[PDB]
């Protein structure tokens, strides 16, 4: 229904790493030098441009935010949203009679149902749908890999900043202004890199893949329902395949009625 | 991708100077040679010609050779299948010509005379596989160079540090020499994660993009030699574009 | 041959031979023991003799194989099929052991007998598999030594750090331990990514070239048995030839 | 094979003892126990008893139980072929014995029985695969312990550094404390790459060698099952040996 683990996890990780700053004097502005911000964040972002052209690096907050939003209600409702269609198309008319499949929810069900009203061989439908899922999973893998690659570049430039801070520190041996603000750069570059990489990017990079998996299973059960409608089956026999996709606790979650 | 280099260097140069320090200490010309020459030397040891000369033909395709794919492939194939449907049958080369990118023509010139789906499929898979291998090898070479760059930067750091214990007096120099001796690994790691590792991943990303495009082209050509029409073939082909391109294509 | 081993060590020497005109300080006898002795000894632990003895009979047997280029083999197959055709018969042949180095003889000395070709394919492709596996094992040995070298450089780094520590009361033991820590890892770095990891990866590309050459010889020896003319055999054999050499061979 | 273990410690110990200081500082009974007991404990967490106890009963096979193969498998197969073919029959059990070492008879007792070449192939290949898997398991168990050793060495290093800081007088204890702290990670790193990872790769290499040997057996067991010309069989058998051995066997 509502993936509640990532919103609580983000606030937990960041609240802890933020209370860490304000527990030794409470001053929070000493963890912000503008140089280290450039070296780490701008460095990794520019290497991300070198890697990804601005055209499909623009799909960052598109095929990442479409997953992170996930406002689609198609979680368990798919079952009854298919049994009612089968009931209204079976003994309540004929298959070439749209109920709401030109105004219903997220496009995949819409797409398949627009396909099943017009005469199409089931093999063709199966191939297009599987080929429509695999490409979805490939776009999700591309986005997740884009995230993990940035998670990799961030501590790389953390190391680079550590080297900058050591070079410009050893260079000016005693100035009372380069020992500090030269060690500050070395430390804060590493801090931003090692915080960014495994708090924002590597977790959320790995997170995109499980959302891709659950959406793939959802699309698989949707495909099975569409082929069931195309073949023509009673809702009684329909459940023998659709219910065998959820989790065992999720199985009984709806069978109360 | 050519904007990214000047940006990744300008941002780190701004970071190296925002303290107000003199960037004069981040420059010695010998260390540039140690790092880059050693990396490219070990690269010559590592990789032979006929395979070092194929890194260039692909690193000269990520900056150039811009096609028209991912929105025009669908248009082209839907209009051919409209032609292949009872008006302009499979023996019509008028539309196949003038559309030669490198690949769509390769299959559209071989579908017209005679082939079997289980043969065009195989030769197309082999072509995509060799194209994937070319990019994989170029990316592996660039990643290996990003590996030998900080390795030889470390080597140069050690070269600069070893000749410092001999002249071990005590004033300011045990620090100045550690400074000017650490520049070599700085250049090493900086080149590694600013030029080579990003470009190494760039080759892999472009290989994925071109694999998706060539699979779209393959599916299209296989759909031409099937006797299919739009609203089925279009539905099939369209299931490769990002959902952004599905709304930016449905409006056209 | 682009193996620029002279270049990396030349750049190191040019780095080593800086203002400290005496490079006798880049030689610590203890550091040699730790790094090289420990690496070689863990190589004996890993690879026992009669196997580690092959460090100079594959690694050395591949770096002097410039006695037969992949065009010479085409011309040899050409003029052997010349006398295998109408002019002469496939009964008497002595050009096998005329100016061939080690291979193409086992295939020829076998096909001149009256046996089936299927087993010939089965044995020759088997030889190619075993040869690639042998080269893979040699290159894996070279990479494993490049893995143990910097590991023992780190070991020596810890050794020199501990030995320098707790007795910072003079200028003899601290100097010895400092030099140990520095040059122990200097040897390991200068060794791994300049002699072993380059040459570990390099030995696999020689293996690929020899594998392609051997598949070519295999196709040739199978064409000798069958009744094919060199004209119609050339195109069946030239398929494995290098792309840039196809035009370079057509000069004839 | 154990001759390398004494060398891999004596060489580094000489390097540790290059007239710098007593090795009494390099030894601390606390840190030894932290490192080794911690790695052993994490190994007990990883592998339980009756499965970590099976380690030593496979690793001891690497120190003994040598093989006669690579020169003698070929001879003991060609003479068996010459004795079965042309003489009596393949069911000659009189001479099939007297050389029952480990594995040749595993299939030779079956070819004299009524089977098909596929089922014997499947039993032999299954045996080879499970041998490789058991060796992979042992090698994994050794590399994993080589990984835990320096991890717990660093754990002990951190322990020593914590209880050194805020526990000292800040005058001269900083150095000696760091020495006796890093002793732990020295022990961990040394034990890892001197004992375990070399032994893990030794298990892997031995699995490779015995796998080639068992494939060499099976290819030839199937030949005896078919009763083929010993010439062809001598040729396919010898096509497994290093070029020095392909000749060294030739004069025998």
């Amino acid at each position: 229904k509502r993936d509640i683990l990532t919103p609580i996890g983000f606030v937990l990780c960041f609240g802890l790493v933020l209370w860490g700053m304000a527990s030794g004097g409470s001053n929070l502005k000493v963890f912000w030098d503008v140089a280290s911000v450039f070296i780490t964040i701008g460095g990794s972002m520019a290497a991300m441009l070198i890697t990804y052209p601005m055209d499909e690096f623009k799909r960052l907050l598109i095929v990442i935010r479409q997953t992170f939003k996930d406002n689609g209600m198609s979680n368990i409702d798919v079952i009854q949203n298919f049994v009612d269609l089968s009931r209204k198309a079976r003994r309540e008319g004929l298959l070439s009679l749209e109920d709401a499949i030109n105004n219903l929810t997220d496009d995949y069900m819409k797409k398949g149902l627009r396909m099943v009203v017009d005469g199409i061989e089931p093999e063709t439908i199966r191939e297009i749908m599987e080929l429509e899922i695999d490409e979805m999973e490939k776009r999700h893998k591309s986005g997740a890999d884009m995230l993990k690659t940035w998670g990799g570049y961030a501590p790389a430039f953390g190391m680079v900043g550590t080297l900058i801070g050591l070079i410009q520190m050893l260079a000016n041996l005693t100035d009372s202004s380069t020992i500090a603000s030269g060690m500050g750069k070395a430390l804060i570059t590493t801090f931003y890199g090692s915080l960014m990489a495994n708090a924002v990017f590597n977790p959320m990079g790995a997170n995109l893949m499980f959302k891709s998996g659950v959406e793939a299973t959802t699309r698989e059960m949707v495909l099975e329902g569409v082929l069931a409608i195309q073949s023509g089956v009673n809702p009684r026999i329909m459940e023998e395949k659709l219910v065998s996709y959820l989790s065992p606790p999720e199985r009984q979650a709806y069978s109360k009625v | 991708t050519p904007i990214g280099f000047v940006l990744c260097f300008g941002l780190v140069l701004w970071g190296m100077a925002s303290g107000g320090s003199n960037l004069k200490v981040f420059w010695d010309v010998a260390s540039v040679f140690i790092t880059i020459g050693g990396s490219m030397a070990a690269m010559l040891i590592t990789y032979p010609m006929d395979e070092f000369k194929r890194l260039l033909i692909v690193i000269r395709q990520t900056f150039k050779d811009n096609g028209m794919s991912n929105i025009d492939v669908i248009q082209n194939f839907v209009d051919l299948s409209r032609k292949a449907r009872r008006e302009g049958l499979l023996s019509l080369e008028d539309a196949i010509n003038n559309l030669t990118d490198d690949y769509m023509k390769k299959g559209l010139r071989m579908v017209v005379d005679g082939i079997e789906p289980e043969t065009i499929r195989e030769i197309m898979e082999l072509e995509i596989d060799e194209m994937e291998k070319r990019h994989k090898s170029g990316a592996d070479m660039l990643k290996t160079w990003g590996g030998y760059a900080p390795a030889f930067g470390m080597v140069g750091t050690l070269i600069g540090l070893i000749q410092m214990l001999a002249n071990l007096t005590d004033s300011s120099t045990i620090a100045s020499g550690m400074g000017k001796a650490l520049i070599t690994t700085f250049y090493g790691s900086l080149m590694a994660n600013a030029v080579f590792n990003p470009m190494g991943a760039n080759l892999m990303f472009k290989s994925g993009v071109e694999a998706t495009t060539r699979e779209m082209v393959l599916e299209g050509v296989l759909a031409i030699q099937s006797g299919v029409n739009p609203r089925i073939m279009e539905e099939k082909l369209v299931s490769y574009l990002s959902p952004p391109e599905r709304q930016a294509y449905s409006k056209v | 041959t682009p193996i620029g081993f002279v270049l990396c060590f030349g750049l190191v020497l040019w780095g080593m031979a800086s203002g400290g005109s005496n490079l006798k300080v880049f030689w610590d006898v203890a550091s040699v023991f730790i790094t090289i002795g420990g690496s070689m000894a863990a190589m004996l632990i890993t690879y026992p003799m009669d196997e580690f003895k092959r460090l100079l009979i594959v690694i050395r047997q591949t770096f002097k194989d410039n006695g037969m280029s992949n065009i010479d083999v085409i011309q040899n197959f050409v003029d052997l099929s010349r006398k295998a055709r109408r002019e002469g018969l496939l009964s008497l042949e002595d050009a096998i052991n005329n100016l061939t180095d080690d291979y193409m003889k086992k295939g020829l000395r076998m096909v001149v007998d009256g046996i089936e070709p299927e087993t010939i394919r089965e044995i020759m492709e088997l030889e190619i598999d075993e040869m690639e596996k042998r080269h893979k094992s040699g290159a894996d040995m070279l990479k494993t030594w490049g893995g143990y070298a910097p590991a023992f450089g780190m070991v020596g780094t810890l050794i020199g750090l501990i030995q320098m520590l707790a007795n910072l009361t003079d200028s003899s033991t601290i100097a010895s331990g400092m030099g140990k820590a520095l040059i122990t890892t200097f040897y390991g770095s200068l060794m791994a990514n300049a002699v072993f990891n380059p040459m570990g990866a390099n030995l696999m590309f020689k293996s690929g070239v020899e594998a392609t050459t051997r598949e070519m010889v295999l196709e040739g020896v199978l064409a000798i048995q069958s009744g094919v003319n060199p004209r119609i055999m050339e195109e069946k054999l030239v398929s494995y030839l290098s792309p840039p050499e196809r035009q370079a061979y057509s000069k004839v | 094979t154990p001759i390398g273990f004494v060398l891999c410690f004596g060489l580094v110990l000489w390097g540790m003892a290059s007239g710098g200081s007593n090795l009494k500082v390099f030894w601390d009974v606390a840190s030894v126990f932290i490192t080794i007991g911690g790695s052993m404990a994490a190994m007990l967490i990883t592998y339980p008893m009756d499965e970590f106890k099976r380690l030593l009963i496979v690793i001891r096979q690497t120190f003994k139980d040598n093989g006669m193969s690579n020169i003698d498998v070929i001879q003991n197969f060609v003479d068996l072929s010459r004795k079965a073919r042309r003489e009596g029959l393949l069911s000659l059990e009189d001479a099939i014995n007297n050389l029952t070492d480990d594995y040749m008879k595993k299939g030779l007792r079956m070819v004299v029985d009524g089977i098909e070449p596929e089922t014997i192939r499947e039993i032999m290949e299954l045996e080879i695969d499970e041998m490789e898997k058991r060796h992979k398991s042992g090698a994994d168990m050794l590399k994993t312990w080589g990984g835990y050793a320096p991890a717990f060495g660093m754990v002990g290093t951190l322990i020593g550094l914590i209880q050194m800081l805020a526990n000292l007088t800040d005058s001269s204890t900083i150095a000696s404390g760091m020495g006796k702290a890093l002793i732990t990670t020295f022990y961990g790193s040394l034990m890892a790459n001197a004992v375990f990872n070399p032994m893990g790769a030794n298990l892997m290499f031995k699995s490779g060698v015995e796998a080639t040997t068992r494939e060499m057996v099976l290819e030839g067991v199937l030949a005896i099952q078919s009763g083929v010309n010993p010439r062809i069989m001598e040729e396919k058998l010898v096509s497994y040996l290093s070029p020095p051995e392909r000749q060294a066997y030739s004069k025998v």
């Binding site: - | 990003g146 900080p150 | 910097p150 450089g153 780094t157 820590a181 | -």
Partner: peptide, 29 residues
């Protein structure tokens, strides 16, 4: 490669900088 494999010799040379700083620490001046 993995883009991280020099972190071994990186740690080596960082340890060596630490050793030089130890060398700057037997006298502190």
């Amino acid at each position: 490669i993995r883009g991280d494999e020099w972190l071994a010799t990186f740690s080596d040379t960082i340890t060596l900088l630490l050793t030089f700083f130890i060398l700057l620490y037997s006298f502190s001046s």
